[PDB]
Amino acid sequence: SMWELTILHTNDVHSRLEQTSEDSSKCVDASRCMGGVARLFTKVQQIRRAEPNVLLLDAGDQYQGTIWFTVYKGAEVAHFMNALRYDAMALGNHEFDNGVEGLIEPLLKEAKFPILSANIKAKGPLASQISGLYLPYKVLPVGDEVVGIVGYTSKETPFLSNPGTNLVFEDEITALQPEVDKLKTLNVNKIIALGHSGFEMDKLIAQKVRGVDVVVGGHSNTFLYTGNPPSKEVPAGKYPFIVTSDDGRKVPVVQAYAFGKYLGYLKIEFDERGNVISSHGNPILLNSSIPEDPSIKADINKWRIKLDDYSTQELGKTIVYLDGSSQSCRFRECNMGNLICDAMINNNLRHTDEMFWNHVSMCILNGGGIRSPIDERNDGTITWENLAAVLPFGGTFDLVQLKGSTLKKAFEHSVHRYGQSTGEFLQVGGIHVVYDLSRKPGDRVVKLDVLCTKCRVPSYDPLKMDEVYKVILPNFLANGGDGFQMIKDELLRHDSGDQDINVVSTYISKMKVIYPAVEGRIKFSHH
């Protein structure tokens, strides 16, 4: 016979428990808001009532994003994922942001669904302490059939989070294969690979892991769609994306963007042996047509009260849209990058006591460190809550002494694989850079002018490779993050500075009204 399975899936929700603006930022105009767990429940329940065979799965990065996680630390994730009745979750990189303890105690011990990762192996005293709290797979009953779900997590988690020294993140394909093999031997013939490594790993898993029928992914915030997409996000492929495997099968690969804006919806048709005959669907845009569930909403409002202490005090006003979108700040000059770098520079010049850094005028900032926009409509108020979503990583803005050559290398690294929405793209201050993307990686920086320090009047002069420059940047960059190894290995001095979010709030309070522009600090040429 035929056997139909509906996979409903979310990924990279990133602490967006409440409904959001179109662009993921705080909801202001309720009529045009989107996502949030209350709306998501309504739609999930609409599908479950109409189709007998449904799994609702999460591909990780529920942790970290808003003051929801700052205050509740994963308890909100356990609680509201339980209310939605998720069948399964793959662990993501952000599930390690409060260490292993911060994963165990709030989420793994409270979740009423299996949490999965087959490539994470525990070692030392931790092995027995966490044994079973997450599994390599789970076999779930769905009607009269069983469906195997096998988990995986990005092996870049040690560089993006705090998983500690007692977890080993194995290569995904190598770890998955014996588990999918195990399940086949246990006559589990339908197998879903659920995990958090990116669209490109997902296609490889689909290609290389024999026995996997569907791949449900995350980490790259990938939007896939078939036909005319319903919002501002531009499709990266069809939904589902069809990989032709190494063993002659057609493996559908799915993802559902980010921030709870869409519920993925894939209908698979299986044969009696568990081969995929076909599949179809699309992500469902969770727009204001779908009501928020009253019960979930009311429960969100109860949890909300403790968060309102982060939104009482207006820090200041923006009269412009502060564009902290992934699609701006990882691809080109973005005015939120500018605001942050100027804030960094401005705040550092107050510390007059420390005379070495008292004329620092140059700044660099990883695009991937800017995590949300802030909207200017409705008086463009800026609260702590709004800032916390732009800067959730609790970092510092540190001061480094760098060679011109080191800095030149950083600017090449910034665009070395340009076009894949990766976070190493640098927003700046006191620096005018020009990239020519038709040139080879490592040779795309064609102009690099920085504010002089030796001069009485600051002006943008060409960077010289044997000169030394003083620069304010996140400690993440200072310690070699986003693969900026040259910064870490080659810097001449590194000083701790102030906490990132205090720096920017301090700027906003001082300025009262802000209005950062896209000024031409980062340009692209063709010559």
Ligand X SMILES: *[C@@H]1O[C@H](CO)[C@@H](O)[C@H](O)[C@H]1NC(C)=O
Query: Annotated binding residues, as ranges?
Result: 12, 14, 61, 93, 196, 219, 330, 366, 371, 393, 476, 482
Sequence-ordered alpha helix ranges (H) in 332-431: 335-348, 384-390, 404-414
CA–CA dist 344, 398 (Å, integer): 9
Out of 93, 98, 189, 427, the only residue in the binding site for Zn ion (CB under 5 A) is 93
Q: Which stretch binds ligand A1JCF (CB under 6 A): 130-138, 187-195, 362-370, 465-473?
A: 362-370
230 part of the interface to ligand X, by CB under 6 A: yes
What is the smallest separation between the CB atom of 65 and ligand A1JCF, expressed in angstroms? 9
Q: Which residue(s) pair with 10 in the sheet?
A: 58
202 part of the interface to Zn ion, by CB under 5 A: no
Any idea how long the chain is? Answer: 527
Please identify, using beta-carbon distances, which residue of 292 and 375 lies nearer to a copy of itself.
Answer: 375
CA–CA dist 116, 172 (Å, integer): 13
Going by C-alpha positions, the residue among 140, 152, 201, 147 that lies closest to residue 176 is 152
226 part of the interface to ligand X, by CB under 6 A: no
**Residues 501-520 contacting a copy of itself, CB under 8 A:** 510-513, 515-520
Instruction: Write the binding mask 9 to 38 for Zn ion: x where contact by CB under 5 A, - elsewhere.
Output: ---x--------------------------
Please identify, using beta-carbon distances, which residue of 255 and 335 lies nearer to a copy of itself.
Answer: 335
Q: Which stretch binds ligand X (CB under 6 A): 45-53, 78-86, 284-292, 315-323?
A: 284-292
Residues 6+ apart with CB under 8 A from 411: 426, 433, 445, 448
User: Where do we find the tokens 């008292």?
Assistant: 358
CA–CA dist 21, 372 (Å, integer): 11
Binding-site annotation: residue ranges for Zn(2+)? 12, 14, 61, 93, 196, 219
CA 18 to chain centre: 17
289 part of the interface to ligand X, by CB under 6 A: yes
Q: Which stretch binds a copy of itself (CB under 8 A): 64-72, 449-457, 481-489, 498-506?
A: 449-457
Distances in Å between the Cα of 24 and the Cα atoms of 34, 54, 272, 303 are 8, 27, 42, 20
Q: Which does 213 bind (CB under 5 to 8 A by kind): a copy of itself, Zn ion, Ca ion, none?
A: Ca ion
What is the smallest separation between the CB atom of 157 and ligand A1JCF, expressed in angstroms? 9
221 part of the interface to ligand A1JCF, by CB under 6 A: yes
Give the H/E segment covering residue 46.
helix 37-48
Distances in Å between the Cα of 360 and the Cα atoms of 157, 206, 262, 276 are 33, 50, 43, 60
432 part of the interface to a copy of itself, by CB under 8 A: yes
162 part of the interface to ligand A1JCF, by CB under 6 A: yes
395 part of the interface to ligand A1JCF, by CB under 6 A: yes
CA–CA dist 390, 76 (Å, integer): 20
Tokens for 59? 């591909």
CA atoms within 13 A on the CB side of 379: 7
What is the smallest separation between the CB atom of 232 and ligand X, expressed in angstroms? 12
Q: Which does 340 bind (CB under 5 to 8 A by kind): Zn ion, Ca ion, ligand A1JCF, none?
A: none
94 part of the interface to ligand A1JCF, by CB under 6 A: yes
DSSP state string for 175-242: HHHHHHHHHHHTT---EEEEEES-HHHHHHHHHHSTT--EEE--SS-----SSS-SSSPPPSS-SSEE
What is the smallest separation between the CB atom of 331 and a copy of itself, expressed in angstroms? 14
Q: Which residues bind a copy of itself (CB under 8 A)?
A: 319-321, 323, 335, 349-350, 352, 358-359, 361, 376, 430, 432, 451, 456-460, 510-513, 515-520
Q: Which residues bind ligand X (CB under 6 A)?
A: 230, 285, 287-289
Q: Which residues bind ligand A1JCF (CB under 6 A)?
A: 12, 61, 93-94, 97, 160-162, 219, 221, 366, 368-369, 393, 395, 422-424, 474, 476, 481-482
